[PDB]
Amino acid sequence: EDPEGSRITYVKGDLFACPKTDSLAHCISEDCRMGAGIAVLFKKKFGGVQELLNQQKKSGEVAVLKRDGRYIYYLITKKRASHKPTYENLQKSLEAMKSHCLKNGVTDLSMPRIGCGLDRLQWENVSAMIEEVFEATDIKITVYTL
Numbered sequence: 001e002d003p004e005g006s007r008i009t010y011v012k013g014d015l016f017a018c019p020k021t022d023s024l025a026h027c028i029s030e031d032c033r034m035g036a037g038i039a040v041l042f043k044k045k046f047g048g049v050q051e052l053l054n055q056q057k058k059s060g061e062v063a064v065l066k067r068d069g070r071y072i073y074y075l076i077t078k079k080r081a082s083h084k085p086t087y088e089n090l091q092k093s094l095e096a097m098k099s100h101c102l103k104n105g106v107t108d109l110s111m112p113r114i115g116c117g118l119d120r121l122q123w124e125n126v127s128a129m130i131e132e133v134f135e136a137t138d139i140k141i142t143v144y145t146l
Contacts, residue, residue, distance in 0.1 A: 007131050008141045015144040016045060018110035022142070025073040025097060025111040027090070027119060030058060032074075033081045038112050046072050059085075060092030064100060071106060073097045075114065085119050090126065094133045101139055110142045 015024065015038070026042055028034060032052045034043035043049065048065040052074055057063040063074040075093035077085035101109070115121035130141060 005140070007134055008127060008143055011142055011144050012146070013144055014146070015110055015112055016041065018142060018144070019108070020068065021070060022108045022110045023071040023073060023101070023106045025075060025109055025114065027075045027077045027085065027093070027114050028052075028063075029078045029081045029083065030076055031080050032063075035081065037118055042072070042074075048072070060089040060096070062093050062096040062100065071100070071104065073100070073109075077115065077119065085115055085121065087121065087125060087129070090115050090121065091129055091133065094130065098133050098137065098139070102137065107138055108140050108142070110144060112144055 018024070026038060028039060032049055034040060034049070046065055046067050051065060052063045055063045057074075057076045059076055059078055061076050063076060065072045065074070075090070075097060077089050077093055100106070113123055113126070115126045116123045134141065
């Protein structure tokens with residue numbers, strides 16, 4: 001009797017108070033503008049705007065910063081901040097993140113309800129997508145809501 005446990009755990013609280021060893025993820029546009037929502041706090045806490053731009057990542061890719069021995073993943077899901085993401089680009093970006101996690105030994109991720117709220121995707125779809133992308137890995141995801 002060897003319980004895998006849930007892929008996704010839900011926590012009411014502050015994403016940025018997650019374990020310091022967890023990597024973090026959220027969604028941004030190719031323009032790397034982080035002027036609304038939780039992105040504002042990613043910008044304040046981790047910076048990296050020019051470093052991210054220099055990676056020249058496109059929709060469906062992931063830009064990455066290393067901060068304090070773990071990673072901050074910038075899922076590039078749309079071209080511009082005022083646009084809306086497709087599920088297809090979100091999936092591609094998550095796959096990209098997964099492959100980086102696996103290459104770099106990341107086993108624990110924390111994130112908000114990615115794509116949802118202002119990006120106007122439906123959480124039931126995103127959670128299913130996360131489950132599909134991370135199946136057959138031992139990467140656990142904690143999703144934070146204030």
